[PDB]
Copies of this chain bind each other. A is one copy, B any other.
């Protein structure tokens, strides 16, 4: 007693919009630092009937029965996860149930500190996440600033983490958790020094490595696992998995942490796991461990370095004057345009990037940069030599933006009026579509 006819027949209206979405992705230079493209195997898992199963609890300690094949899936996911990040299952545990990165962080913080507990993270404006304690004068914007008592440390005027300030804050504020690992930070992190501060104050060290996970896995950047009590990561960014997350906890350094984190995930916050997600994560975590994926991750860094260099060669400034990872933050002040304006221009030409604050922006009302990253275009086969074209396109867009602002004014309402029907953008859009459209697409 059900309908079995395909999506195209069952719901033509939805299928058209989806096929358009697919056309837009195929014909876009995607530079969103946190985005990637899943292969067809990850997506076969996500559409698997394993999501019919209610399997609350954990393997072998399940509330319901019928869970033998689910238990093997979740266990194959935890194992593949600890292996992928080169940690021993005797020293480290992992939870594979968090539904996304924000959930994973809120659950992990709760486990460590509880309600009213004190936390320290990087301010949003300097490159931290919303879930690292973010608030405004006007509001406790993240539950992490409301259910917990948070204090935020800023980067310096050059965009680097200021460890002397983190200490100044940590010693006076006395948090139980200090969060490092960030959303738009173009450099590597000094975890040993974070660990040194956390010891002085008796705090936990929490590393959120969602943006740099593949670099940590493949041994290309610093290893937070040598120093952290807790490491979280999303599975969908550079890792190229499904939308999901992982919480790692150090058993050796804190026995009884396994119970705290597991119980924080369920039943404190979640109910039934999404086993299609867990399967998909298993599938990608296998690919992660292969030598082919290390080559991909290496290619991501090489592209990022070449893109930075090509941008610098065209007199464009970068926060920290370069990158050690997959992402670049462009400082647009010298052209006297906002990131908000350049995003709009880049949209008009099928270039996806996002506006991003730089250290000299006091408010975040109007950020003065944009964030770009290479994992998505590296997945589509772009090599170092293709980065000059991407830089060329970005430089042409910055220039068009400057032209449009002269003609239409500095107010965003007015600026956008210039965007439709500009001949240069249509020319450039066309060039983007031809190059993007022919690249491999999983």
Chain A residues near B (Cβ < 8 Å): 1-7, 10-11, 13-14, 17-18, 20-22, 24-25, 28, 32, 34-41, 43-54, 63-66, 68-70, 72-73, 76, 99-103, 106, 110, 114-115, 129-131, 134, 141-143, 146-147, 236, 240, 242-243, 267-272, 274, 276, 279, 282-283, 286-287, 292, 295-296, 299, 343-344, 346-347, 350, 352, 354, 378-381, 440, 442
Nearest chain B CB to A295's CB is how many angstroms away?
8
List the B side residues contacting A66 at CB < 8 Å.
24, 28, 347, 350, 352
Instruction: Knowing A14-B279, A272-B243, say if A39 contacts B142 (CB, 8 Å).
Output: no
| B242-A51 in contact (CB<8A) | yes
Nearest opposing residue in chain B for A139, CB measure: B263
| B47-A14 in contact (CB<8A) | no
Nearest chain B CB to A109's CB is how many angstroms away?
12
| A440-B1 in contact (CB<8A) | yes
| A17-B271 in contact (CB<8A) | no
| B2-A440 in contact (CB<8A) | yes
| B35-A52 in contact (CB<8A) | yes
Question: Please, how many angstroms separate the alpha-carbon atoms of A37 and B287 in the complex?
Answer: 30
| B73-A354 in contact (CB<8A) | no
Instruction: Knowing A7-B44, A14-B76, say if A54 contacts B35 (CB, 8 Å).
Output: yes
List the B side residues contacting A134 at CB < 8 Å.
267
| B2-A22 in contact (CB<8A) | no
List the B side residues contacting A272 at CB < 8 Å.
100-101, 243
* Contact residue among B52, B269, B270, B347 (Cβ-Cβ distance under 8 Å from A36): B52
| A24-B69 in contact (CB<8A) | yes
Nearest chain B CB to A113's CB is how many angstroms away?
12
Question: Please, how many angstroms separate the alpha-carbon atoms of A248 and B48 in the complex?
Answer: 29
Question: Please, how many angstroms separate the alpha-carbon atoms of A110 and B146 in the complex?
Answer: 10
Nearest opposing residue in chain B for A77, CB measure: B14
Instruction: Knowing A65-B343, A70-B21, A115-B146, say if A52 contacts B37 (CB, 8 Å).
Output: yes
